[PDB]
């Protein structure tokens, strides 16, 4: 696309930060011009502060409006705590159990070595532990994770690979701990 | 920190593009469709348990546009620097021949929030069953987006995501196929 006209971008972010549910709440109101935060309201501070010279005129103009500062000060309750109770049942309390699969990688990059994949698909929330075991001893060498992948649809995936040297007499176990299940998920692979 | 809820809005000139959405720990709760003037919940079930008055979002966007015009002049007409996207293609789950799956095109770390995304099957554009998200915020004030293509895995078919952005010298292709 040959549209070379200059672009100008204005963003506003109202961030509600929660610690131990609604026990501690911090509101951060942020104004961003192009890619540079210019001015912000932090409920901990209680007024607008310029973060760049561009934002000075706005911090001065807004800080001199006593009722705006009052409404912003109360927002931690009328906005953050209010919205947390409305959303709590389908966000904070959301739980979705992973599908766990073990298979040899369709790609084998290392000789005398069987690369095994533990796939963990479709879980929520993000906190998860994936561990490899061989005849019930934990394996930590030769483990490589994609880490946490957000699918964009309120689910996560992760792939945890094990570089193995195949022997007779072995069972490999991928063990998954996740808040959605009361005991760990296990999937075995045998040669 | 247990959790973060963000109300993120933007206005972009000269495209005349406005967006209004809520984020919970990096996932979209909902956005307002500026054309239909209606709340669109990310998962339909969310709309069973909450509601939002969309006209509130349209009034905020009018103010945001008015403010962009002030800030544009106040900056001595300083335009945004283009940051081009990082692009990744992967499936929703491990591929099994003739078992339905979804290709994800993840477009990350870019600005401004304008991109043209196409799916290709065996070199030709495909639109059947495709879907996308709006522009999702990042803490560095860049954007993220996802595009999705449902498909039946085969050994015959190959796919690409095609991404166009002003920060790129050329349009990008990210390829996916299932071999052997």
């Amino acid at each position: 696309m040959g549209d070379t006209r200059p672009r100008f971008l204005w963003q506003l972010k109202f961030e509600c930060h929660f610690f131990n549910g609604t026990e501690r709440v911090r509101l951060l109101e942020r104004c961003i011009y192009n890619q540079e935060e210019s001015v912000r309201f932090d409920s901990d501070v209680g007024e607008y502060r310029a973060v760049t010279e561009l934002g000075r005129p706005d911090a001065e103009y807004w800080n001199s409006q006593k009722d705006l500062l009052e409404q912003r000060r109360a927002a931690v309750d009328t906005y953050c705590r209010h919205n947390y109770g409305v959303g709590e049942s389908f966000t904070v309390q959301r739980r979705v159990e992973p599908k766990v699969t073990v298979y040899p990688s369709k790609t084998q990059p290392l000789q005398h070595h069987n690369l095994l994949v533990c796939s963990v698909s479709g879980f929520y929330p993000g906190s998860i532990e994936v561990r490899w075991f061989r005849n019930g001893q934990e394996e930590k060498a030769g483990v490589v994770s994609t880490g946490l992948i957000q699918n964009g649809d309120w689910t996560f995936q992760t792939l945890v690979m094990l570089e193995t040297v195949p022997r007779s007499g072995e069972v490999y176990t991928c063990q998954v701990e996740h808040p959605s299940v009361t005991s760990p998920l296990t999937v075995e692979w045998r040669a | 920190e247990e959790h973060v809820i963000i109300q993120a809005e933007f206005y972009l000139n000269p495209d005349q593009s406005g967006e209004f959405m809520f984020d919970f720990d990096g996932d979209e709760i909902f956005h307002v469709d500026m054309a239909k003037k209606e709340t669109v919940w990310r998962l339909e079930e969310f709309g069973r348990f909450a509601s939002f008055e969309a006209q509130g979002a349209l009034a905020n966007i009018a103010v945001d546009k008015a403010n962009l015009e002030i800030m544009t002049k106040r900056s001595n007409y300083t335009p945004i620097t283009n940051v081009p996207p990082e692009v990744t293609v992967l499936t929703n789950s491990p591929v099994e021949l003739r078992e339905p799956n979804v290709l994800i095109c993840f477009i990350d770390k870019f600005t401004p929030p304008v991109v043209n995304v196409t799916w290709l099957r065996n070199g030709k554009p495909v639109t059947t069953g495709v879907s996308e998200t709006v522009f999702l915020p990042r803490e560095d004030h860049l954007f993220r987006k996802f595009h999705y293509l449902p498909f039946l895995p085969s050994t015959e078919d190959v796919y690409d995501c095609r991404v166009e952005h002003w920060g790129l010298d050329e349009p990008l292709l990210k390829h996916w196929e299932f071999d052997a």
Binding site: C31, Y61, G87 | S51, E53
Partner: peptide, 16 residues
């Protein structure tokens, strides 16, 4: 049913 309402912060005009 009794609607659970999300509340929006209102954006305000900058220094003119």
């Amino acid at each position: 049913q009794a609607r659970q309402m999300v509340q929006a912060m209102r954006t305000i005009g900058t220094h003119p």
